[PDB]
Structures are given as structure tokens and as C-alpha cells.
Symmetry: D2
Subunit: 253 residues, 4 copies
């Protein structure tokens, strides 16, 4: 079984790839840095169980992995975009354009490229990593939030046609996921260190902590494993019970 | 009070313009066909209560109406897109891109242009016309369905930031809205004539009929009146009880 | 046209009753205080446009209004229940039974009693005043919240069978609805007087204010008017943009 | 670790208890028929890894299992209720009362009895087996459908308070979950043996098949493993892509 995990250095990329590997998949990895030969080799050295690819664009990635490992069985579109808190009228229109390109068009493109080989053999697993922000939106994050919602509905809508070919489709929408060295979106600094940040996280989640790469990775492996295909179409909120809702005056923390 | 309704010939364009004009708003009306003087001036003869405009692109549209009528008080983004049932692997990536430009980036651009003046007055009403398809996705309509979902969350996210400036933001998402002579998306032929189309609507909606422009016009006017601003954030499902879910074997219609 | 509003003194009862009357409905009013001829006659004096009934049980409440005005056209089940913040293990099970009785059984019993005459003349309007609590749960309000959610879905489920009879069904879920002198659930005091409470409502809603009885009443009258039946099965969040979600450290409110 | 599965011969009970035992939980099993010596003993010789109990009532069961095996670590409220297709005016009000008792009060009562011990040690796992009918309600199932939706929100709200104490709370809403010999709610005969039923499941699910008990049991065992507590508060729609929303005339199945 061959897996593809994108932007592997960021977001839920590492927890996906490491736990898919441990579960017996062959895991090919995309990342923007893998354009530079040193960074692809530094990573392939540090994680010899992972197979970093240099391919950057969606279609060529699917063919590069289909060529080298025979097929693509599991697609994890781990999508990222660097956003900015802005009031609506401060955005430029191209700001929304890049957001939909990185969080909506990119996963659509990969499914577009991998679908026929999955449909023809009637086997496959597709997982979008989206965002839990559609579920409780902060103000002044209009582009990133609305785009992630288009990705959630894309996964849901795709499950409706892909089920007849036995291809389950999933959307994992995290929030407050510890991203370690990656800045998307909760690096150890400052979310694990700065006490104003650790106290924010204890307030806004139910579990009063960040989620872990292992947790995200366990979910990806479980859905990728074929053990529960009947969840096809599900949007998962991986946000530790976010959002916590502000209660009336006089109520304890 | 001055209103803007887009693509006024199609979807819920007529009901919005026709009913906002009765509630006393000045209704500027946009449409692709108003590019040609002949089409625009025919429309203003047929509809003396309405004010057609030649301007077609977002910033120009806000400018012209603000120039002619002093300000833009109500924004009805009546958004449309040429559809096409298709499996995921048969779209071109350009098919999604265009679907997102028309159904996400365009309402965004309009809000992006008009928000500062509304925010200046600390008043305004913004209504996206979207789609009930995200609430019950059909298979093989994944570009139009997911794009429309991004437009709903954009409305809801926007409401969080603009409420501070006393601007409600709403999304009306319709399905099975009788579009008279417009092919977007339920023209009289065949949807009121063909006995297979007629029995489809009876089966899949709870009220067993198409939706009227008057009903959408009434909803748009109600929201733009300032009588129920406290509904801000709402995605309305204007779909007669769609979807009707298929019951067990041997059960009546 | 003849309408019933329950618990008229509390929650969305006064706004419903008053605005329904201004639109020309005969408004018969149920309330627990109307058991004393005292309270009934004082209400009838203060509100001569409203018709307070003594009947308390749902079946005989429906029949008495039917016997006095011929038929019931609009049902507004304005349900309430006295609430207690509790950890789950500190409730008695009876606390939840009482909550379900007031918030699911009661509106069920009323529609159980009124639906035949509505179905028969193939006209009628049913509106539940539920709650916006299911949309963003506070911790330690599990009984009241899960109960209101049951009523939200009962409204949506009722719309599926009743549209065949041209009966639309609605749920309206308020949060931070100013209830004047009613303690259910946002009386003028403390919520418009104590500046800590004033700051809480400015923090948690997008419009930074309470809802008004009139806003709720305009929504009910609009729904009850037959102007927009295609919205059947809708759950309206009348919570002024609640919930606002607490943002990252260092970010303005 | 000790787990309790209720109504274990029915619905998602056999998959919950079989799969949880394979993961090395002690699975105490509650079921109605275990009031009979011969029923409980037969079950125990056929399933030597499961521990059937005779206790029926919620407080009695938790205490028995805490008595025999020290504590309750995992609770699976597999709640079941017989009902009929019927219009709203045909139910007695007692029919909804019973639905609420069997599908809402009982899960509540189990958590109310066990929450205190789980909170004391700040560890535990609570899973409700509810229903996916609230996601796509059929007409004329208002009592069951709405009760289930109240259990879903019970789970979600309970997660917001038990997160502090590190107790994740989940709901799992099946539909078209094949139930083998149990009549709740998709027994093998007729759903896999009759062609009229075989085609219905092919039409209304995206995967065109029923859900196996192993799939539910795998889900239950995953959430009870402590490998993904960050999912706490999730309602999972274990229904295989249900519902498949009927498409325009002339379009193929």
C-alpha cells in the first residue's frame, strides 16, 4: 500500500506520514522545500522510512508516485496557506484567490489526477486535512475560513460519487494542533512555551491542551486502514472540543 | 435606501429586485446582458421601478451606484454559474477555478468593495444568494456544490466581523426556485410542464412544488428592512423542505 | 386568522403575541399564571388586543381556541423551563426528565393535537421557540441544551411530513433575547443594568447587544404570514451572531 | 480496562463488545434478556470473552461492574427503541415519552451514575450509539428521530464539561448498520436476502452496502483506545454516505 502526504513538514503532515509508515504503508512525501536537493536529502536522511519526492505540482506528483511505486492507494491532501488577520475591506481580492488556490484548488487537482486509477480498480482512500475554523469562526479570517469550508464540502460531495467505486473520502478539520517546528499553525513557540498562549489554549479547548501529531496520525492511519470505510463523507473536528463558549458572569473557569 | 441586485435576470434576481422595490428601496440592477445599451434600455422600459446599470465588474459597480444614488445600503449578491454534472476525473481543473471565481470570489469582491462605506455609516445589509446544494449534495456536481458552501461560510464569517459595525450578513441558499424564463436554475419548461420533472419536484421537496420568486423576494426584503438584524450569520435553506430522504421499501410516496 | 402563543409572559411570548396581533391575527395566549382568574383578567385588561385562555393542557388548549375562534391557524410553542447550571453527576435524573417534559413533550403534544385540523384544511403554520444553546454549548447545561436540540430536530422532522399538507414548520432558537420582566432568560435586570453583564453581551454576540422582543416578533409574524413557506424545516439562530469565538492572544475584542 | 456495552444483542452492541474485547478490555455486557438465567448463561458460553450481567437499571449496573471489576473505564450506551412509521396526529403523547426515555434519559442516567468515579481519577471514555436519522430525517419518524438528535447533543454538551477531567465524550450515529439476527434495525433477513431491500440500500448509501458490525466495533475500539481523545465532542455519521439525494430526471442511478 502506497500513501501520498503533502506539505509533510507542516500542519498534520509529520503525524500523518510517521503514523502511516508505522502502520505499514509506503509513504511518499511532498513539500515545497523538496525542490532544493539538499532539503530533500536532509529529510530523507532524518526519516529513512519516508520517501520524499521532488515533484511540486498535483498531476506530476500522482504520476511520479504511480510510476515509482506502482499506484497511489492513499491520498492525504495536507493543505496549508499562510493567512493574515484582516477586515474584509483590507484584503486584496488576490488574497482570497491564493487562499482558494492553496486550500481548495490543490486538493481538487490531486483528486482530479488520482481518481481514475482509484476508480478503475475500485479501491482507494482520500483524506483532506482541512480546518475546524468553519465550525466556530473568528472574525477577520474570512478568506482562510471560507476556503476551508469549500474543502470540507468537497470531501463530503466527492464521497457521494466515489462510494460506488469503494473509495471513501474524508475531511479532517483540526484546530489547536501542535505543529512543533512548523509555523502552520501552532508551533511549540509560542503555544507550548509563552504562558499567555498556554492559558489561551486551556480556556478555548475542552481538553485544555493542544492536540498531538500522534493523535492526528492515528486518525489518518485508522481511516486509511480500511477498518471503517462506512464513515465515508465525514467531516471530523479534531479540535479537542473547541470551541469553549464564554459563560455568564460569575461562572468559574 | 439604495439596493444592488446582481445578475438580475436570473436565479433570485427578479424576486429580490421586484420585492425590494416595493419595500421602497432604490434598486440598482446588474446583469451580464446590460453590457449592450439595447438590452439595458429594454429592461428599464419593462421595469420602470428598477434602475439598470452597464457596469459589470465589482469595484466599478459599487462606484457607479454610489455616484448616482449617493450610497449602497443593501448588497444582494445573486450569484450564478453554468453547471454540468460530471465525475471528478472528467472535470478540468479550470472547471473548478471558474466555479470558484463566479460563486466565491465575486461575492467576496463585492463585499470587499462596498464594506468600507457601509462600515463608515455603521449600517448596511449584505445578502449572498448561494445554494441549498451544500445541505444535501448530489453526486457528480462537486465543483458547484463545494464552491457554494464556501460562499455560505464566507457570509457567516463576515457576520462575526461586521456586526460590530451594525451590518447584518446573511446567506440565502435556495434549491428548486422557479426561475421563470431564466435557465438558472429551474425554468418553467420543463420543470412545471414535463410530467417527469413535475413528479421529481413533488418527490424531493416537502411542499411538493417549486419555490416562487415572490417567496425569495419576500425573504430578501424582510432581511434588508432592519426588522430582524438579530438573525445575522444565518444560512437560510430556501428549498421547500428538500431534501426528502428515500424511505424503506413498501412505503408510500 | 387565529393564533396561539404559549407562556406569553416569558421568553419570546410577548413579542410573538404583540406582533402577530399587529398583523391582524386573533392572538389567544396561554400562560401558567392564567390559572388564576386574577392574572387572566389583569392580562386581558392590559393587553385588550390579546385573548388570554385559562386552559393549561395542550389538548384542551387547542380545542378551546378552536371552539372560541373556529380553528387554530398558527401555533407558536414558546417553550420554557427553569434552568440550573450543573455537572452531569450532580443532577438528579428527574432534572433531565423535567427538562425534556417542558421542551420536547409539550410542543409535541400541541402539534399532536392541532395537526389534524391543519392537515384537514391543508393550511397552518407551526413555530417552535427553542434555543440557540445547541449551536454552542456552555459546559454544565447539558439537560436544557440537549432538550432544546431535540425540539429543534422535531420541528425539522415535522416539516418533512406536513409540507404535503401545505403546512410549514419552523424552529426559532434564540440566545440573548432580552425578556424584559420575564426571568426567562434575559430580564432587563441584570442584563441591561449591571455593566459586567453589559460587557458580556458585547463580548459574546456579533451585534454586541441583546435581541429585542420586536425582532423576534417580526420573524414570527413574517413566518406566520404565508409570505415565505418555502423556508419550511429551518432552524433560525436568533442569537445576534453568537457565538463569538475568543481569538488569539494580543488581538482586540 | 473495564467497558460496559448495553443492549448488547442489538444495534451496534455485538460489534462494540466483540471489538472492544479483542483490544483487551473486559467487556461487561448488559441486555434485556439477561434477566433470564438461561439467556445470560447461553450468551456467556457462546461468547466466553464477554461478561454478561443481569443488572438492568443504570445505577444498578455501574455499581455491579464497579463491584465485580473495580471501576468503569469505558461506557458504550448502545441505546435502542422500537417504533413505527406514523404521522404526528397518530402517536399518543406517551409514544414520544417512551422514545425520550429509551433514547435520551437512559444514556443520561448512565453517565449521571458513572461520571463521578471517572472524574475522580480524571480518566474515562463515554460513547453514545445514537442514530444518523437526524442528519437526513425520513418523514413520519418524528419521535425517534428527534429523540436521537437530543442524544447527539447530550454527547456534545457533555464533552465541554468532562474535558477538564480528561474524559472524552463521543456519539456515533449509524444508519443502515446491518444488525445480524437483531431486529434493530437492519437484520440480515430481509435486508441482505430480499431483492427489494438489497436495491434500496444500493440506492440510498454512497457505498451501496450496509455497515458491518466490525466497522462500528473498530470505531468504538479506536475512540476507547485513547489514541485520539482530541476528537472529543464528535458526532460520527456511520451511515456509508447516506443520504443519497435524488437527482434530476433522466440521470442514472
Amino acid at each position: 500500500s502506497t500513501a501520498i502526504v503533502t506539505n509533510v513538514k507542516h500542519y498534520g503532515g509529520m503525524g500523518s506520514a510517521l503514523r502511516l509508515s508505522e502502520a505499514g504503508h509506503t509513504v511518499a512525501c511532498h513539500d515545497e522545500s523538496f525542490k532544493q536537493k539538499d532539503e530533500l536529502e536532509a529529510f530523507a536522511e532524518t526519516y529513512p522510512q519516508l520517501k520524499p519526492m521532488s515533484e511540486q505540482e498535483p498531476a506530476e506528483l500522482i504520476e511520479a508516485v504511480t510510476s515509482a511505486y506502482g499506484q497511489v492507494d492513499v491520498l492525504v491532501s495536507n493543505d496549508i496557506f499562510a493567512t493574515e488577520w484582516q477586515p474584509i475591506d483590507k484584503y486584496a481580492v488576490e488574497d482570497y484567490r491564493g487562499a482558494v488556490e492553496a486550500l481548495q484548488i490543490r486538493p481538487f487537482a490531486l483528486v482530479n489526477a488520482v481518481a481514475s486509477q482509484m476508480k478503475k480498480r475500485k479501491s482507494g482512500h482520500i483524506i483532506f486535512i482541512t480546518s475546524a475554523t468553519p465550525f466556530g469562526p473568528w472574525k477577520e479570517l474570512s478568506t482562510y475560513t471560507s476556503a476551508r469550508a469549500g474543502a470540507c464540502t468537497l470531501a463530503n460531495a466527492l464521497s457521494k460519487e466515489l462510494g460506488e467505486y469503494n473509495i471513501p473520502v474524508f475531511a479532517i478539520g483540526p484546530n489547536y494542533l501542535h505543529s512543533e517546528d512548523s509555523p502552520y499553525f501552532y508551533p511549540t513557540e509560542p503555544w507550548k512555551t509563552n504562558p499567555e498562549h498556554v492559558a489561551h489554549v486551556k480556556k478555548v479547548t475542552a481538553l485544555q491542551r493542544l492536540g498531538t501529531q500522534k493523535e492526528l496520525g492515528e486518525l489518518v492511519a485508522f481511516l486509511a486502514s480500511g477498518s471503517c470505510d462506512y464513515l465515508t463523507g465525514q467531516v471530523f473536528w479534531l479540535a479537542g472540543g473547541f470551541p469553549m463558549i464564554e459563560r455568564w458572569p460569575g461562572m468559574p473557569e
